[PDB]
Amino acid sequence: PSVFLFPPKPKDTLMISRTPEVTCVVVDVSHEDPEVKFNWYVDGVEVHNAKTKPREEQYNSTYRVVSVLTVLHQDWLNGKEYKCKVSNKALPAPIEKTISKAKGQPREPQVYTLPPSREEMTKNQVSLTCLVKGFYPSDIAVEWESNGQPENNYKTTPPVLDSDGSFFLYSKLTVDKSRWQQGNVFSCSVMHEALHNHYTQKSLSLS
Amino acid sequence: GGPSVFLFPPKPKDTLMISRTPEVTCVVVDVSHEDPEVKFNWYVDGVEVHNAKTKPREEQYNSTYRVVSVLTVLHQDWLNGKEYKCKVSNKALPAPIEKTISKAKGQPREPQVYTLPPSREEMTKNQVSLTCLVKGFYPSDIAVEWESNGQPENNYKTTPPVLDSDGSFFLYSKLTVDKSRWQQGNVFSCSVMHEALHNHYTQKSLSLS
């Protein structure tokens, strides 16, 4: 059987209101050795409050058994080390994967907004750009707002690694050229641990 | 509990540059000890070909074999959407496995390319960032570079193609330059290679003011 350990969503670890969960996925458990017994540890110290989900048989030969652990916000942002430990008869020794927040100094993202280029202004819709660079680790979340209302016609590139070991990304919001003319304000907002209040906003409006 | 086949396409740049070699790799894994021999047959649009380079078997750390076979593809063949089928045979299988690969089947779309300068707030920095927006292209195979005067700049990074809401793709490319070098009106150039541009190449330039 094969063990895969997953980290929480970036907004879940950043907002005091939400619930971050580290997940531990067991795959390839036989119908003759079906017993999977987990053992979680936070800095090697065993915890018992994991919520093992209903065992679901995957559509092939085998089941997959998933254990959800809520993590403390302080702990994950102090990159404590979460050890999943799945035991099965079919295994030689118990398998032990280990996840944590990315090690090293957290670095503040720089957030810049870029307005559509003139060549684009000839088209029906235009492209509002948000550059976010110099941040570490790569766990981040980017959204678009206008008139304090969620804009949702955007796409964001993945974090790309840069020469200093920090990350950058761009987010592109697509709007009707008409709407951007008449100088509406559109806002790019970024949530990252290194920010004060784990949030910054920047904005952009027709000059 | 049987061998698994995986068939990979050529790298984007390799399909787009006349100097590179675009190749199709067919990888067999989970080959057992008692049934280790793997036979490859390769078909280009249904016609069998006999110049793949099949590598020797190679035992992996998990006590199974991995056997691969590499077929070079012609640049024009791949771009015209020929279909490359790898037929793997192995005594542990009920009948041969067949996988087929080709270019992406959707309607080609010319990339539109827009250059963006630094933002005013960025200028207060020691190093500023020149931005290329390549959008609306399809398929996602694309290559992007930067050029100054006539030499290829080498402090750029490019995002992967991102799937847009119309089923085409976009990416951005970022180049980091000295603020004082963008100052003084130097020209920088963003070159894009894509199957559906004329001569498969377009170039856009960025200057101060």
Ligand SMILES: *[C@@H]1O[C@H](CO[C@@H]2O[C@@H](C)[C@@H](O)[C@@H](O)[C@@H]2O)[C@@H](O[C@@H]2O[C@H](CO)[C@@H](O[C@@H]3O[C@H](CO[C@H]4O[C@H](CO)[C@@H](O)[C@H](O)[C@@H]4O[C@@H]4O[C@H](CO)[C@@H](O[C@@H]5O[C@H](CO[C@]6(C(=O)O)C[C@H](O)[C@@H](NC(C)=O)[C@H]([C@H](O)[C@H](O)CO)O6)[C@H](O)[C@H](O)[C@H]5O)[C@H](O)[C@H]4NC(C)=O)[C@@H](O)[C@H](O[C@H]4O[C@H](CO)[C@@H](O)[C@H](O)[C@@H]4O[C@@H]4O[C@H](CO)[C@@H](O)[C@H](O)[C@H]4NC(C)=O)[C@@H]3O)[C@H](O)[C@H]2NC(C)=O)[C@H](O)[C@H]1NC(C)=O
């Ligand atoms: C049999 O079968 C099985 C199964 O399968 C299936 O089925 C079948 C029938 C078919 O179809 C298939 O195909 C399918 O799939 C199988 O199994 C398998 O296995 C494998 C192995 O073998 C594996 O693999 C792996 O994977 C990984 C990942 O994955 C991912 O992705 C995918 C896609 O496709 C998917 O599917 C998966 O699942 C995943 O995902 C993920 O997950 C996770 C967990 O869970 C998560 O997390 C989480 O999340 C959550 C969320 O939430 C929620 C939301 O959403 O929000 C909540 C809410 O409330 C709700 N909502 C509502 C409205 O309701 C929701 C709900 O619930 C629902 O969902 C809705 O519907 O929810 C939260 O947030 C938490 O907190 C968290 O935690 C996530 O999200 C997801 N995501 C996504 C995107 O999706 C990967 O990664 C891997 O890779 C790795 O590994 C390898 C080796 O191993 C290598 O090669 C690579 O490279 C990698 O590596 C790595 O790397 C890194 C860096 O680089 C490092 O770090 C490390 O260390 C490394 N490692 C090593 C080297 O080792 C792989 O790929 C898979 O997964 C499986 N699958 C499954 C499905 O499970 C089996 O196998 C078979 N058998 C045979 C074939 O024989």
Ligand SMILES: *[C@@H]1O[C@H](CO[C@@H]2O[C@@H](C)[C@@H](O)[C@@H](O)[C@@H]2O)[C@@H](O[C@@H]2O[C@H](CO)[C@@H](O[C@@H]3O[C@H](CO[C@H]4O[C@H](CO)[C@@H](O)[C@H](O)[C@@H]4O[C@@H]4O[C@H](CO)[C@@H](O[C@@H]5O[C@H](CO)[C@H](O)[C@H](O)[C@H]5O)[C@H](O)[C@H]4NC(C)=O)[C@@H](O)[C@H](O[C@H]4O[C@H](CO)[C@@H](O)[C@H](O)[C@@H]4O[C@@H]4O[C@H](CO)[C@@H](O[C@@H]5O[C@H](CO)[C@H](O)[C@H](O)[C@H]5O)[C@H](O)[C@H]4NC(C)=O)[C@@H]3O)[C@H](O)[C@H]2NC(C)=O)[C@H](O)[C@H]1NC(C)=O
């Ligand atoms: C044992 O072992 C072995 C080995 O391994 C090793 O060892 C171990 C022990 C450890 O250590 C580890 O770590 C190592 O590695 C194994 O094997 C394995 O197996 C697995 C399975 O099981 C596999 O997996 C797969 O994968 C893939 C990918 O892969 C890649 O990547 C990775 C990372 O991640 C790596 O690892 C690999 O290698 C690969 O890589 C690649 O490769 C290639 C070749 O070479 C390359 O390319 C090339 O290159 C060259 C240079 O060199 C030149 O350039 C040329 O030109 C070319 O050709 C590349 O680059 C690379 N990459 C990188 C590195 O990055 C994936 O894909 C898969 O997945 C898939 O499948 C699955 C199934 O199974 C599923 O689930 C998923 O989902 C997927 O799916 C797919 O998908 C797609 C999309 O999505 C599709 O398509 C589609 O279709 C549709 C229809 O409707 C539509 O049309 C659309 O549009 C489209 O798109 C397809 O179809 C699908 N498929 C299916 C479903 O089927 C997987 O994941 C792996 O790979 C392996 N590995 C190796 C190494 O081999 C075994 O297993 C063991 N055993 C036991 C028992 O355990």
Ligand SMILES: [Cl-]
């Ligand atoms: Cl807490």
Ligand SMILES: [Cl-]
């Ligand atoms: Cl050729």
